[PDB]
Ligand binder design. Structure first.
Ligand SMILES: [Zn+2]
Ligand SMILES: [Zn+2]
Lengths: 49, 50, 60, 97, 60, 37
């Protein structure tokens, strides 16, 4: 991806692996922003994850 | 007391580096199959407010 | 301003909220005392013996 | 068995784009699955490390290769669940398929 | 508009935000920010590069 | 707050599999009912 919401463009290298690995790596970097942002924007879910 | 303490800290060649102790400790080999590792505990004791 | 969802405190920056979420409503430190294969047994034991709970010094 | 040989058991493979790079030594001794001074003890793989560590290394190096810029050392810092729980679920899935 | 999720300042363009991140938060370690870390890694990269030629200079 | 976060396999499957198979194999040896007897 070129730019994710909350990030800065052009931070992902072309050597990013396809498939689940690419997904995991992206989410791993994107983790904290997603968690914090979700808390502000949405009500909490009903039981722990 | 605060006044003197700050004055002391202001002018002193001494430097406190917490890393040196952790490095000296963490590098000790141990078996991973024991249920209690003393290394983790002693780290957990002095880590707070580091 | 940015807010929590558990204690619902408010923060002036998103970064401050993130670290709070990583520190307050996280797991306790006592969980790290032992292996999970024991901690589950410990939890079962305490739950089992909850009937021995000491009464408050008001009903007595 | 080699790192990739065992890691492929869960379809963790090397991207074709990497075939022109000398990734061997990095995966061998640069992707720390358990650095003593950094990792939380909850993530300690214990005896199953014989087949757990390659998986973690593959995940680590994949993330490191993802970001732009120079290659940096990759370190597992924490598993939310215990490493034992992770291994158990993996064994279940391995048995399922 | 865009917000610097650390200092909570607002910016009209991603360019202005990026320049602020590179300039202001040059040494921060907040996980919400990536680019300062990479730039820091690049600085380490250069220092290693010095170690190379310092024991292997170039002759005419 | 928690519902099932403590749930895993909680015993060695190899032993249980060996046990379970053994009991099933020798299940034919079991006793007769007094009615049948
Ligand atoms: Zn809160
Ligand atoms: Zn800022």
């Amino acid at each position: 991806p070129i730019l994710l919401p909350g990030q800065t463009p052009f931070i992902h290298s072309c050597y990013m692996p396809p498939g689940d690995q690419g997904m995991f790596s992206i989410l791993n970097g994107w983790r904290d922003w997603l968690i914090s942002h979700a808390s502000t924007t949405l009500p909490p879910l009903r039981h722990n994850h | 007391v605060e006044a003197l303490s700050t004055l002391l800290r202001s002018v002193t060649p001494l430097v406190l580096d917490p890393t040196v102790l952790t490095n000296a400790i963490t590098t000790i080999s141990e078996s991973t199959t024991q249920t209690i590792s003393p290394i983790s505990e002693i780290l957990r004791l002095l880590q707070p407010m580091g | 301003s940015y807010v929590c969802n558990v204690c619902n405190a408010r923060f002036s920056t998103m970064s401050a909220l993130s670290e709070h979420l990583r520190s307050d409503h996280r797991d306790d430190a006592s969980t790290l005392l032992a292996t999970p294969m024991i901690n589950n047994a410990i939890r079962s034991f305490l739950t089992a013996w909850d009937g021995i709970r000491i009464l408050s010094p008001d009903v007595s | 068995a080699q790192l990739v040989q065992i890691a492929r058991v869960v379809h963790l493979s090397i991207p074709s784009s990497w075939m022109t790079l000398n990734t061997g030594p990095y995966i061998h001794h640069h992707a720390y699955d358990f650095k003593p001074g950094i990792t939380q003890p909850s993530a300690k793989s214990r005896d199953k490390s014989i087949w757990m560590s390659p998986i973690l290394k593959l995940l680590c190096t994949s993330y490191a290769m993802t970001v732009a810029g120079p290659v940096r050392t990759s370190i597992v810092t924490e598993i939310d669940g215990s490493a034992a729980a992770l291994s158990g679920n993996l064994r279940v899935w391995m048995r399922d398929v």
